[PDB]
Structure formats: C-alpha cells, structure tokens
Amino acid sequence: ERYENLFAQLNDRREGAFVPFVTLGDPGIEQSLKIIDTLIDAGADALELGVPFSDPLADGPTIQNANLRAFAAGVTPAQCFEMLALIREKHPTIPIGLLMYANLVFNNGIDAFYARCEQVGVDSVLVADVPVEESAPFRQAALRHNIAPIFICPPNADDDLLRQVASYGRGYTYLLSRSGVTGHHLIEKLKEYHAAPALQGFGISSPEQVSAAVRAGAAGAISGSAIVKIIEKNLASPKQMLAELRSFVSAMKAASR
Amino acid sequence: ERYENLFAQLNDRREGAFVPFVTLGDPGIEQSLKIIDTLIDAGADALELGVPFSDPLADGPTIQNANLRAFAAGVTPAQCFEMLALIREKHPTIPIGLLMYANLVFNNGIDAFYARCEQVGVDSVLVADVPVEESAPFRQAALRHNIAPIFICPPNADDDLLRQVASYGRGYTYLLSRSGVTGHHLIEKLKEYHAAPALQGFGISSPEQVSAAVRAGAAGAISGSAIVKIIEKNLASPKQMLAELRSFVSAMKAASR
Amino acid sequence: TTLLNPYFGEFGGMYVPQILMPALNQLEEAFVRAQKDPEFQAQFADLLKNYAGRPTALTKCQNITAGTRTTLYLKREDLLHGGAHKTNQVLGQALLAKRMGKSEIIAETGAGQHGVASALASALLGLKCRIYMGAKDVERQSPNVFRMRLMGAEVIPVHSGSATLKDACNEALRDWSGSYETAHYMLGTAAGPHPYPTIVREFQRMIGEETKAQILDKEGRLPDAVIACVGGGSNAIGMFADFINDTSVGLIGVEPGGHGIETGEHGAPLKHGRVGIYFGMKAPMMQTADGQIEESYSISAGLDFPSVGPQHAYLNSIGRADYVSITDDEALEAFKTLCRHEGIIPALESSHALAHALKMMREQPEKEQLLVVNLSGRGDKDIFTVHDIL
Amino acid sequence: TTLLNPYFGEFGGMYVPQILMPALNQLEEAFVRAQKDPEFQAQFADLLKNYAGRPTALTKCQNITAGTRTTLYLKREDLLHGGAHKTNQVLGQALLAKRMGKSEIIAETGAGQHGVASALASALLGLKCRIYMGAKDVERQSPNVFRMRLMGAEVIPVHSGSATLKDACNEALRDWSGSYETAHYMLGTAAGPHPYPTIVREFQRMIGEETKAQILDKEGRLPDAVIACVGGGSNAIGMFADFINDTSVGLIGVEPGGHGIETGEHGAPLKHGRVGIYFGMKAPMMQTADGQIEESYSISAGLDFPSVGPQHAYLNSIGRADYVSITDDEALEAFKTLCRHEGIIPALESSHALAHALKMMREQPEKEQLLVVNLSGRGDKDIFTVHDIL
C-alpha cells in the first residue's frame, strides 16, 4: 500500500527513491529513534530497519558491528516492535521495511510474526536467509497480513528466477548490485514481467551511484553500511552524528531528483 | 700368588679373610689413598678397588654415588693405575683386586689392560658385566699376565656352572650372597671341584655376617656399601671418616679370627 | 528444484541467501554425477585406502566388559590418518571441488580437527585452503592452528559474535557468497544447507559399511546397537547409515550433557533444544526464548556445534534412532577407563559414546547385548585437559 | 651354550652380570618355542591386526618427487596404534612374558614412545608395568609420562649418571637382576644382550614383509632401496629383514648427525663412534677416549640410544647395508616439506630417513629410482619443538 503510493508519487515527479538502512537500537533505543527521525527529515523516501540478530551471516563488518552495538544495549525483538509502533505513530506514510533473519520470524510462528508486523504498521519484510526456494510459508503469511514479501534478484539471475521474483514479490524488487555480503538487462526484464519497482542495494554509498541506478531504470537505491558508518564514527558525538547523517542523506536524496 | 699366600697364612691361623671394597678416587685421590691405608692398618686382608665408570649397571645407589663422587674429582683410569702403583709400592703383600666394567678393559685392548695390571702389581680383576659365557678372552689375557680372573658363583648356580667357575677362576671364587645389585651347599661343591677359596660378597655389613660366612666354609667375606656409606656420611669430616672406617674394619676383621 | 530431497521429514532445507543458491545447485549436481562416476569412486577409494589407512580395525574390548553379558567392539576411527573420522569426507569433498574445477577451499572449525583434516587434504590435492575459526577457539587450540599452517593452510580468526564455531560458520558462508566461483566450502559436519547433510553422510558411510562386514565376520550377526557421539552428526550418521534398514539394530546418538541438562550448560539441542532456522537449515538448536542463537557447552570442544544434522532430528522423530546425553564427568570416567583397561586413549568427544555404552552395560549387567561404539577419534589432543581437571 | 647365535660377526654377545644369564637363557628358550607355536603366532597376529591396525598403508608421494625420476613410497607406521612402530614388538614381548608366566613388565624409555607402547600393551594384557626413564627425559616428556600413568604404568625417574636413556637402561638391568623370576624386561630396541636384538627384529619383521608385498602389488618389482632412521635399530631392521636376501635392494640406515659430525654433537656411533662393550653387547658406541659412555645428541629425542644394534654394525661391516647421517637442519626441512606437500606430519626421527631420500632425489634428479622410506612414527609429538625452533 505505502510502497505503491510512494512510487506513484515519485514517478509523477520523475525522481527516484532513496532508502537508507539502519539497525534498530543502534547505538541505543533513544539515539536510534532520533537517527531514524533525522533520516526522514533529511529526505528518506522509505526505511529499511534491521532487528538485531546474533548471527547476521549475510552482512559485512559494518552491519555486524551495528548488530553488536544494539545487543550491547540489550535491544530485543519485543523492543524493536515497540519502536516500530512509535515510529509509525509519528510518521503515517513513510514505507517501513524490516530486514530479518529467518529464525526471528520462525521463532514464535511465521503467521504470528507477520500479524505483528501488520499491527504495528510495517510495510514489508525481507528475510535475508530465505531464498525463493524456501519462501512459500513466508510469502503466504506476508500476503495474508498485507505485508510485502521482498524478493532478491541477483546479478546472475536466470529467466526462471526473474519470473518467480516478479510473481512472488511485492512492494519493491530487491536488485543486488553484486554477490557477497553488505559493505540494466535485469531491470528491463523485471519490468517486462510486471515485477514490483526495483531498488538497487549493496555497495551504494555515493550520490552518483544513486543517479546511476535511477538512470539505469531502477525506481531507487538503498544504502546501509554508508549510513551505519556515520553512526559508528560519531558515538561519542550524538549531535554531530545526526548532523552528518542529515548531510549525507540530503546529498543522496538530491541525487535521486 | 699373593692370594695363595694370604689364604695359606690365614688357614694356619684358623681365621677368615676380611676384604673391603672402595672406589678409587672417592672422594678424592688424596683422601682415597688415606682411606686405603686406614683400611689396611685396620685389619684388611685384601682390597677390592673399583675404577670409576660412567655406567655401573651392577651396583646399587651406594656405589653409584661413589663412582659419581670420584668423577666429580676428575678421576680417570690412568690416574687409577698411578694410584695402584703407589699403593703396591707401599704395601708389598696385600692382595689387590680390581672391580672393572668390560668397556674399560676392552677400550685399549684386553691384553694391554691385563699387562698394565701386572706392571703396577694388581693381583686379580673381576669384570662385573662379563659372564663365564663371554669370559674367554678376559681369562686368557689374565692368565698370560699372572692376574687372577675372578668368577662369580650365583646362589642358584647349577652343577655345570660350578664346574666352570672352579676350573676358570683363580685367586678366589666370588660367592654371591643373593641376586640383585650391590647394597653352604655351593661352598662344599666348590671345594669338591678344587675351586679357588670362596669369598662371600653382597649385603655383608655386620661382624656376625663375617663370622657366619667363615663358619659356613667360606675363606672370608667382602664388604663394600657398608664401607662406602661411612665415606659418604663424613665427607666434611676427613679425620672422623678415617676414624670410623678404622673402627668398622677392625670390628669386621675381628669377627673373622 | 533440486535433484535430491533437501528435507528429512520437516528438517533440513536450503535456508541461505538467494545469491548462494547457484553454488548449492552446482554442488548437488556435481555430487550426483560423481556418485555415478566409477573413476571418481576409484580415486576416492584409493585415497581412503592408501593415504588415510582404511579399513580401520573393529576392536573387541576384552577387559572393560568383564563380569557382564555385554560384548563391546570399538570402530577404530582413531587410527585413521589425522586421528579422527573427519578425514574420510574431506578427501571426498576435496575431490568434488576439483571435479567442479575449483582451486580454493574454505573451511570452518571449532576444535580444529576438521580444520586439520581440511588442511591435510588440501596439501595433498593441491588446493588453496583458508580456514575460519572463532578467535576463542584459536586461543584454545594453538596446536591444531600450527598444524594447519604447517600444512600450508591459511587460518583466519573470527572475532564477531561469540567468537566460536557458529561465528566461524557465518564467516565461511559470507566468504563463499562472493567467491563460490573459484572456491568450494568444505563444511565439516552433516548439517548446514542441502546438499551438505547428504554429501557428508555418503562420504562417511564407509564407517558403518565396514562395521557391518567386520561384525558379521567376527560374530556372525548384526549388533544389538551402534552408539556414537553427536556434535553436528557426521560420525554418527556415518556409522548409522548402512544399518538404517536393519530394523533390529538400535541406533543411539549421544549429545553432550555438559554440567547437566538441568544447569542449562550442555550441548544437547536434539533432545533439549527447540527447532529453529539457522546455518542454512531447519533443525533443533541452542537458542534463547527470543530466537537468538546460543553456543553448546561441553568439556569436549568437538561437540560444540550449537544445532544438529537434520537427518538425526528426523530419525529421532520417527523413532528409528534414540538420542541420549552424557555429562562431562561421565565422559571423563569413560576416558580414564578405556586408557587403563584397553590401552586406548579416546577423544573426549568419543568418550561420550563410550560412556553411554558403559552405562547400558552397568545398569543391566546380566543383559546379553552386542554393542559397537564408534571411536570417532584419538584423545592425545585431550591429555592436557584431562590432566588439569584431574 | 645357547639355542641361537648371540653374535652377528664380531658384534653382539651377552655381556651381563652372571646373575642375569638365567633370565636371558629362559627368554631365548621361550622365544624359540613361541616362534614354533601356531597358537602364539595366531594370538600375535590377531593383536597386530585387530588392536594395532596392521597392515599399515604404503603411501606413494605424488607431490614431493615432482620434476624428478624418483618414485617415493612411505611405509605408514605413523598410522599404527600408539603412533609409532614400537607397538609391534611390545605386543610380541608382552605375549612372551605371559608365556613364561611373568606378571610384571620392566621397560626403559628416552623419548617415551616405547614407554607409551609398553604401557598400552601392559594395560591390554593385564601386566603390571614399571617404566624407568632418565630424570632429564621425564622433564622433557611430560605428555608421554602422563599417558603412561593414565594407562596404569608406573614411571620411575632415574637421577643417576647423565639422567638420560643409558642411565634408564642401567636401572632396568639392575632391577631385572633381582626380579627376573616374576618380571620381564621389555627392551625397546634391537640392541642389548642376546636374545633381544634377535627377538626385536623378528617382532618388527612384518614392516618389511608388508612393504615387499605392497610394493610388488603396486610396482611389480622390489624397491631400489629401503631407507630408515637408526636410533637403536628396531624400525630399520624391521624394514630391512625380509629384504636382506634380495641383493638388488639397497638397505640404507640413517643416524642422527645432530649439529654436524665435525662438531662432535651427533648420535652416529655406527659410522663415527668406536666399538665398545656396554648394555650387554659389543657394538659401536658414543664413548670418551678413556672408555666412558657418552650420550647421543639429536634434535629428535628418539634417536638418543648412545650405541646401535649389533646386526646393523654387522650388515655395515660386510657391505650389505650402508649407513649415513642427516643433521638437525636437514631433518627439520624434511619435516616441513612432508607437512606442506603430502599432508603428513612425520616424527622427527623418521624425518631423518625422509631427509636422506630427498637428498638422493635432489642430488641426481634424473636418476630413475624407486625408494621406500620407513615412516616410523607421526610427529604430532614434535609440533612444539618445531614451533619453538621456527
């Protein structure tokens, strides 16, 4: 719902979307809530929020430490959902996507997890370690609760995969910039198969990359490590952290217009 | 020669022989020469002198340490022969027997070793690790140089061995008191086979043992560890050492009369 | 779609990032083809026989069972080159890597035994080997770390997470997600995403196959039960496999009970954990009420995998195999007993299996039973640990 | 008189105190009878196969000889239970002790490998085992000392003399001289008084017998030369024995050269010592100009016997076998090379034999030659030593 409206609005302005990623609770619940508000006020079209997990086997050192810092603050999934409800109560239209690891979704029941997402106002869920091959129960539960299940389109994806990602995905299609962990042709075929708008992710850390993605045909770009890095080098300076995050996000978003 | 005369003399007095053992050079060349003179002046009928060897595998802790002390003084086989010449120059009739380990005899030639023994005045040689089975070259070289080759008669010796020991031995027959290392029927059979006079050794440390051996039919008794023990517990007291050795030897010899 | 079933009942699967699926598909296809290739089988057999030392003996204990009606045999994997069963399957996986045209090997290790096995196989077969190991484990396994480097392997400490096995497992998958084109991930146990639980079982199956032939030759019948410790499940499934269809043969897996199940300090997820999804598979695991992955505690470093192979969870579910636990103290007693009565020093991991056999014997001394314990490895490596404790 | 010849040419004999001759005669008779007893041979074979793990593999190096015309095989005694060839003959001697009705075992050890072998055999066969070890060696071999005690053996430090192997050898004979009635002296090498050089050879002969059968099966011909390190001479004579009558097969023994023959700090009495009489035999030894017995120096503790088996001195004298030396540095290089290119960690003792094979290959790379190196033991025990040096 919120994604469909956002992209419809952005399309009318001939601009791409800039979506930053952060770990909920990093470096703390209070500072994280302030970081998130700064991102939105700086120009973020949507958010990608990670729930701290013990074993983020799909993330590089930057996010690894983001998760570690959050755990140092005692951040738990229950507290993350409390944060999410608060964020939605403050910002009614911004699309909110969660970056999850399968066990946190499966833990108390898959259906129950997506039901909770729907009640706090979450818009999409990307389960990092669930490939299309194991996605059935997750995508089904997502749809039953009006949550967009995010699918990943790798750079070496074959036609078969493209069709599956286009048919099963919702909200937006995740376009991997490369293989590995966090730290043109596929775009056209996705549109041919009526796939959800594509958002390029992984390695996006500069304004020109945001402009390149949009010109390539993508609906926008996602940036994580670049954002988290600003947090990790300003821990002792809360204010400056927010100031630098704002300058960064404003620069990235400007590149999408 | 000297053994034959000693036993002939002792027999005429109806007394047994008391033969003490010491390691040449223990605790030093000078003190050893003084120890030896004290033993003789105390009543020793003969002497059993050991040449310090690195691996006395037939001796217990007492003699082991005697050898060690001698090595600490840098005592060598060459110096032992110098000591032996001096001892003989001072005491012309006392029988002198050496306690050797095979390698020291074999080292510079077996024949050469016995030749040296003859030139300094040694009377017998007992090679601790040479059984009758390997004795040929040693006994032959001994006889060629008028040295008595000492053979060992174990407590569990069979008739075959008794005959060999009686035929090959000279000077005196060594009668083992027990098995192991340093720390009646056989006697009679030895006499039946015209064996050299028997001297009991191993474990002899008291006057009554000397009297028991003589009454059993032996021509005398040998005592080592008991003698060496007096040395090892009076190192810091040279004089008292000689005094205690004298009292000990005089007591042992008295038991033989 | 896959060529083989990725699941054992509800357990298993391929829960890895989308980017890693091509690597799993390629590996499964290479495995299926290799299994039908007489040339591959011949090369594998030659290495097992002339390099590793197979077949390993099946030793009858003649002192430890005195006074009872138990007859105990020990499958001697402690005599295999390397000192543990790990060597069997690394040789197979190394050949697979070469079959796919891979020149690099990625491996994870906790106790370091699999690390050493991976390094020796890579040295022999000319593969560039890099090993990930939790920083905490590297500190506690200096000997094994040096052996890996001596054999040309690159050891990489992992400081993330709890700095242990699970963290090394994550790093391995992170590395592979961006290097699978030229590197093969040599997983060390019968767990992880399909096809690994299947591949590791088939490459360890000779343990059970030999045991069956040997016990039939020596006793003229199958054992009443085969017993094996369960860390990740490789030595146990290797012993169990050929006996699964022999319904009369009991299959007993022994998880580490640590300081006692009730203390919470153990490594028995199959019977005392909760099903979850991690390390590419759906299986029972050590995890918090929230769903965070925890570590497995045991006196033995080798029984540290915080989850368990999916086939074991399946065999347990249908009642074909039974799983139990043995505490640190019970394993220590079994270790000392084998040393003194049979002159064999067992790995502390293997001592858990032996400890359960001893219990079966001691609890019912007049029960006639023929048992085989898989002695997964030798315990020279545990001498210091046993010494300090004692 | 004896049943068998106590001499190999001028070397050998029974140079022990008269009191010990009955024990040697009894042992020789028990040995001769056992060698003609099918039941004894069957028991020995059963232990070797089902307990120790025989036959051991014959491994073809596929990397270390690349670029040369040398084909190298390694007889894998490192895979035998215990980790060294020592296990073979202790099992045989333990059976002999029981045949004579003995209940106690006396053993000497330097590196501790034979000590461990003696302890494991005694634990298995129910014999009371006491082991003499020089105090200096006990300090440098804490691991092995603990393994011996774990297996029920009594370890006794010897502080006399230089506090090393030769001193332990003396203590063993001192003990036996007064306990031979109920205790058997399990000598650890092919040296000492007759019948030991003969008994140890016959109880290690399977090394060569297997090698011959294996090389004929694999290459269809006998090797050009078999190479083995020589401490006391047991692993070497075990490998040489079955090939002595095969005149075309070279027999090469490798003594430790230590820091270099010219430095005087070595352990090569056969080629650089002088014949003497000690430890019950006439053989070449490390001794001073005066005739005092000295110690053998080598980076490897196992090549510490200060003399050498009489049969080796004899084989050298008649030109049937050739003896050479290898320095600490040459052995270290061979150790590192095998680890990195074949994935096998060799004992530092065995590394001396490998080092000479490598020299034969490297000095004449285009010379076609088929060589077999006896890998007497594994080198996990030498990891720390190699580590500190490097």
Ligand SMILES: Cc1ncc(COP(=O)(O)O)c(CN[C@@H](CO)C(=O)O)c1O
């Ligand atoms: C002798 C022995 N027996 C049992 C096990 C447990 O694993 P398994 O259950 O896969 O057989 C191990 C594992 N060792 C793993 C985990 O520490 C390693 O990385 O070396 C072992 O080394």
Ligand SMILES: Cc1ncc(COP(=O)(O)O)c(CN[C@@H](CO)C(=O)O)c1O
């Ligand atoms: C692996 C290996 N290879 C070679 C040798 C040398 O002896 P050998 O010459 O008798 O074969 C040893 C001996 N070790 C002796 C002396 O230290 C011991 O008491 O354990 C060994 O342990």
Ligand SMILES: O=P(O)(O)OCCNS(=O)(=O)c1ccc2ccccc2c1
């Ligand atoms: O700038 P970065 O850090 O390189 O990449 C941004 C990642 N954040 S994310 O979008 O929340 C994200 C995280 C991990 C994933 C695993 C595999 C499929 C896609 C993923 C998406």
Ligand SMILES: O=P(O)(O)OCCNS(=O)(=O)c1ccc2ccccc2c1
């Ligand atoms: O009192 P002790 O020390 O027990 O015994 C005295 C030994 N001295 S000795 O006579 O020189 C002597 C020493 C060692 C021997 C080895 C075996 C044959 C006989 C021997 C004689």
Ligand code: NA
């Ligand atoms: Na486990």
Ligand code: NA
């Ligand atoms: Na030697």
